[PDB]
Symmetry: C2
Subunit: 247 residues, 2 copies
């Protein structure tokens, strides 16, 4: 029984809504098939938990978004008049660190993780924390928290780059290196889009609507989560296939 004009602002156009709904179905369907494929491998082979955990969270998230995107607590309706997509940011904290853990052991071989991994993980959690806080903020305080996100974010990209470069030199000279390069390209483009979409969305300058932001986020979600995971899985398969033959 609380009233605010901002909570009733348009969520976007019907086309954007329909586009958004359509991409949820695709995301879900693609996630189920990936989950089936990974589960199929777990029984008949070895499969990293990172690919599976991330994909299960992604499947659940699109289902939850489809039904509850605009209901609390998946969207927060603040006394500032603004609406914060908490489901978006919550999901990042669950999935992004696991992706970075996957990135710290690209070959799947080692049991150990370096000091780089810790610095990488800490900087990414902070990035999300600052970004979420910025979305909740109002006025110039919003710009300050976004800047902290960029600082933490730059640290994450820096460490990530190093992991990719060390990974490139660590993997064997043929297809494996081509795959690592593909993973790096896919990673930096998709991860780079997130801050861009933030600026363009309601939390930023409101160029995009809620539905419009959702459309864009679902595409880069598929890129960063499902596709990158599938590539990383394929890389791990190649490493296994190579070591048997070449030792």
């Amino acid at each position: 029984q609380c009233y605010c004009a901002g909570w009733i602002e348009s969520r976007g156009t019907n086309g954007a809504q329909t586009a958004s709904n359509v991409l949820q179905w695709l995301a879900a369907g693609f996630s189920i098939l990936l989950l089936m494929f990974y589960a199929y491998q777990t029984w008949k082979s070895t499969c990293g938990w990172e690919e599976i955990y991330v994909c299960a969270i992604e499947m659940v998230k699109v289902i939850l978004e489809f039904f509850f995107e605009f209901k609390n607590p998946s969207m927060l309706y603040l006394a500032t008049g603004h609406r914060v997509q908490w489901l978006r940011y919550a999901e990042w904290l669950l999935t992004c660190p696991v992706i970075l853990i996957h990135l710290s052991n690209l070959t799947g071989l080692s049991n150990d993780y370096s000091r780089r991994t810790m610095g990488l993980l800490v900087s990414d959690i902070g990035t999300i924390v600052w970004g979420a806080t910025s979305a909740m903020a109002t006025g110039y305080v919003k710009v300050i928290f976004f800047c902290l996100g960029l600082c933490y974010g730059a640290n994450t990209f820096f460490h990530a780059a190093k992991a990719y470069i060390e990974g490139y030199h660590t993997v064997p000279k043929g297809r494996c290196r081509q795959v690592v390069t593909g993973m790096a390209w896919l990673f930096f483009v998709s991860w780079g889009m997130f801050p861009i979409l933030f600026i363009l969305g309601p939390e930023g300058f409101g160029v995009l609507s809620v539905y419009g932001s959702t459309v864009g986020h679902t595409i880069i979600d598929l890129m960063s989560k499902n596709c990158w995971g599938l590539l990383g899985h394929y890389l791990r398969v190649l490493i296994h296939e190579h070591i048997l033959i070449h030792g």
Copy 2:
């Protein structure tokens, strides 16, 4: 310019307010002196970054709480009528993982971290995510998210226990083991209090007021952050002092 009855509910009694304000000063003062002490060691000795990073965040957080506890985005005022202490939960995501990273290398000696560390870190981030979401939630959905927090939380405590036990056997037989036991006692009591305070506070059954919850949280913050860090530092010092003499 939005109206809601819940946003204007009492924050607590004047005694609770005053108690809360007093503990902020103590927390800040204690954090500054610890920061000075750690900084003093960095120039004149070796000092782990975990103790320092955590303490710097804690000093900043109490300063921010003192001035801005009830201002957005440090408190979220939701269309549900409820007020969510986002500053509390944001701070946990920044500091708790670093504490667990410290816990994964108690002796300060190794450069590597095991698969336990990753599982420990992932489960703790999730715990906070579910807990924060529960605080934002309303009705029975709140109970479901809290349960997910307990599941993730139990996993964290399980792995933490193992780290403590392996750490106990790894450290030398005298004072070092006594210190690890002290750290474990301090850790489980302080960490266990968080879910208890959550239930007792406004986000739970509202036995405690906002100020009352703040009082309790500041005490366990000092226990879990500053004191546990100081003990962990002391342990690392003992390991160093022992290895020179005993190899």
